[PDB]
């Protein structure tokens, strides 16, 4: 279950004005950014360039400015149409996954409006089911007027991303397959609606964790568990609040992989 | 150079195969084309793969693709005195496009 | 009409101007410029995506410089002509649309003699 994917974020505001972001993601891990200005990748890590040379790196960059190139253009082309359609946003997800001992597989998703209107099956473009009057208009355009360009996203998504994937897993298996030990520490807030005791654990890595409140040997439900948060180090944070009668026997217990069968055990006074 | 196209010239018999071999070195390169030239005219496109397939039929024309050894080869089968020009193969990532310096096939009649 | 080119042979005596005209098939998003030396294939030039020339490294010297303003037709100039710029100049034009990626569409030449 290991996977590589681009995202495009393409936002069509006027007639004579479109703005365009992208990056390069190994699962949740930002691996690669991209400099819109000079229309280059920027390489995250020190590992992020895989096992490619900068010669075939600089022809991906080549490859994304023609494909940024004609698609902007053909988009900007369409809508001097009906400018009612703008402002709107165009996002991309396409990339490649991995699976063990079998074939690996391609894909390439579009949505315009942050709803569903594409995505590449086998060898042709596929519209969304029902939402899209548009998917089945640019689906006809991609399959009957496009089918060079299909055929380049085929090899892109196939070929070329495995091959590199493979060459980064390889490259950043230590970044990637690292272990970091969670910090945690505990807090109280008066419970505005009785007291908040917070119990907080931040800079864990991978993110599978698992945070409790105890009584004793006693696990006790909390009152609000929070989201898996992300930090900039490329970390985790995770907090568990317990309600209580105010002033004893509470302790948090921090359960993860880094820490290797023990948890951590905080007692509170 | 990263499409090499050694062998300036060939000489083949009329009714013979004629192998126009072809090189490239960039793992990049996603279509190769071969196009036909004849003298005080410009390049005309003849053939074309994809690195998604190996081989290309079109009439009396092949191309065959080897993405392990990175080399393209065109068979002309049989091959006839208006097969006489320069042959350049091609090779393009996004709007790149490089060529070879070419082969004059000769087709001695 | 197809991919065009003026003059179709040109004769100068070294030091002077000389411009190549190239009008591509309408539509066509990308134009080429190679040359073509008696005892060589074909070198690269120039080209444009658009009205803009992203690979401007073909270019022998400072004296040769392309333009396509259009971005439909182009030009290329080279300034006080030598031996060495003795060539067939080639132009070409693609689109991204249909079936094949980069199916270049050549010109019939302009060949240039520079003479002492």
């Known amino acids: 279950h290991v996977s590589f994917h681009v995202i495009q974020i393409f936002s069509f505001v006027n007639q004579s004005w479109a703005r365009g972001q992208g990056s390069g993601w190994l699962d949740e891990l930002q691996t690669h950014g991209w400099d819109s200005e000079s229309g280059t990748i920027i390489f995250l890590h020190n590992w992020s360039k895989g096992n490619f040379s900068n010669e075939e790196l600089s022809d991906l960059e080549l490859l994304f400015r023609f494909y940024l190139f004609g698609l902007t253009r053909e988009i900007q082309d369409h809508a001097s149409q009906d400018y009612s359609k703008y402002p709107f946003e165009v996002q991309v997800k396409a990339g490649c996954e991995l699976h063990s001992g079998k074939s690996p597989e391609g894909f390439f998703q579009v949505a315009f409006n942050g709803l569903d209107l594409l995505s590449f099956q086998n060898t042709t473009w596929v519209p969304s089911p029902g939402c899209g009057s548009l998917a089945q208009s640019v689906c006809h355009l991609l399959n009957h007027q496009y089918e060079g360009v299909t055929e380049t996203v085929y090899n892109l998504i196939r070929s070329t991303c495995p091959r590199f994937l493979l060459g980064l897993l390889d490259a950043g298996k230590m970044y990637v397959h690292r272990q970091v030990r969670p910090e945690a520490w505990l807090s109280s807030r008066p419970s505005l609606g009785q007291l908040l005791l917070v119990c907080h654990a931040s800079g864990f890595y991978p993110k599978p964790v698992w945070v409790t409140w105890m009584r004793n040997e006693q696990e006790q439900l909390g009152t609000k568990h929070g989201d898996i948060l992300p930090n900039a180090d490329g970390t985790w944070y995770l907090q568990v609040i317990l309600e209580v009668a105010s002033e004893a026997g509470l302790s948090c217990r921090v359960r993860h992989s880094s820490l290797g069968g023990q948890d951590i055990i905080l007692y509170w006074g | 150079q990263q499409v090499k196209q050694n062998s300036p010239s060939l000489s083949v018999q009329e009714g013979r195969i004629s192998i126009l071999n072809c090189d490239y070195t960039?793992?990049?390169?996603?279509?190769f084309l071969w196009y036909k030239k004849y003298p005080a005219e410009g390049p005309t496109f003849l053939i074309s793969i994809s690195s998604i397939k190996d081989k290309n039929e079109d009439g009396r024309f092949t191309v065959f693709l080897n993405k392990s050894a990175k080399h393209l080869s065109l068979h002309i089968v049989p091959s006839q005195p208006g097969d006489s020009a320069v042959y350049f193969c091609?090779?393009?990532?996004?709007?790149?496009?490089?060529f070879g310096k070419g082969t004059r096939l000769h087709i001695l009649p | 009409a197809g991919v065009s080119q003026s003059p179709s042979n040109k004769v100068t005596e070294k030091g002077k101007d000389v411009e190549l005209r190239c009008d591509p098939i309408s539509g066509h998003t990308a134009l080429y410029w190679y040359r073509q030396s008696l005892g060589q294939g074909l070198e690269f030039l120039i080209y444009?995506?658009?009205?803009?020339?992203?690979?401007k490294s073909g270019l022998p010297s400072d004296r040769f410089s392309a333009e396509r303003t259009g971005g439909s037709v182009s030009t290329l100039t080279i300034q006080r002509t030598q031996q060495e710029d003795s060539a067939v100049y080639l132009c070409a034009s693609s689109s991204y649309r249909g079936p094949r990626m980069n199916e270049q569409f050549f010109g019939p030449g302009t060949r240039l003699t520079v003479l002492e």
């Open positions: 444009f995506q658009g009205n803009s020339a992203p690979d």
């Open positions: 091609a090779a393009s990532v996004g709007d790149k496009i490089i």
């Open positions: 960039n793992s990049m390169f996603d279509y």
